[PDB]
DNA sequence: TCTAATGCGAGCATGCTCGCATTAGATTTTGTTTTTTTAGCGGTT
């Protein structure tokens with residue numbers, strides 16, 4: 001038929017996976033910041049400040 | 051393995067290939083098998099989880 | 101070539117209608133809405149809408165898509181509004197614009213051939229939209245291109261907007 | 273991914289940098305060339321690895337000298353052309369000595 | 371591959387939102403793991 005679309009468990013697993021992933025990225029950030037002893041620099045870039 | 055399955059030519063196998071490969075090659079199915087096997091190896095009983 | 105020889109080749113002088121690409125493939129339809137068979141067939145059909153460049157005419161577009169009465173086309177990347185005029189999102193340009201590009205190509209050919217005969221074999225990879233020839237090129241080990249090494253740099257090519265490109269063609 | 277450019281910039285400023293890398297080995301020109309030598313020793317009938325070794329500082333043939341090699345034999349593999357230039361050339365020339 | 375910008379017209383409160391369609395852009399990985407024991411030749415063919 002040449003058709004495809006997400007099944008329910010796929011969407012569920014997608015949402016669930018996004019959650020888990022986000023949570024872990026947070027833990028990554030925590031490890032990164034807790035590494036420091038005396039100084040901490042955060043450099044990030046953006047399109048527009050305002 | 052893939053050559054043997056194609057050789058056997060079972061309808062089920064083609065039903066799988068058609069769904070998880072592109073219109074000109076079957077590499078994506080290769081990757082799929084690899085990925086699934088690998089993931090299953092993180093359980094104490096990989097087969098049972100499969 | 102098709103236009104310049106048109107009068108000689110088959111009979112009479114012609115006018116550039118457009119340049120079209122046809123994507124050869126067996127597409128998969130990704131629909132969130134349930135589709136009847138006719139609707140699926142229509143979506144599959146839509147996947148083969150040709151990209152390229154056209155000449156902005158009611159006549160030209162209508163000739164390329166005789167089904168189009170109003171709205172967007174499923175064959176050519178152009179449309180007709182309720183008013184009837186070609187709608188702005190169409191990939192069409194003026195006859196003059198076509199002439200500008202077509203003259204420009206020959207400009208490039210002339211210069212390139214001249215530099216080729218002059219003995220120019222310099223290592224000058226371009227870089228446009230993070231895309232470089234080098235990845236698709238087999239001679240990376242022959243050139244031994246080394247950015248760190250001085251006097252070995254990419255040619256920055258700008259992702260300029262089509263309108264600008266045309267302006268620059270006008271100037272040149 | 274961002275690490276290489278950073279290292280370059282810090283060295284431009286003069287700061288000493290150390291990063292444990294897991295990629296980019298075969299993009300090193302030295303590695304590409306040394307490999308090319310190995311391939312050529314394996315089977316000389318690979319035009320690109322050959323040409324690579326020739327233009328490399330290992331041999332040092334320049335673009336004119338390379339095209340000169342081609343001229344001896346156009347249709348043949350580059351290796352054959354190299355063989356032929358060796359056959360017809362005279363000991364007096366620099367390219368022959370290379 | 372999903373998010374964002376652009377275009378056009380229908381219904382609403384002549385000018386405005388909203389629906390929808392569509393395309394076009396750009397934007398983009400992380401990782402580690404070993405040692406294998408254990409007693410040189412051979413004069414002379």
Ligand code: SF4
Nearest residue numbers: 225233234237240243
């Ligand atoms: S690889 Fe060497 S030759 Fe091929 S494009 Fe990049 S630079 Fe020019």
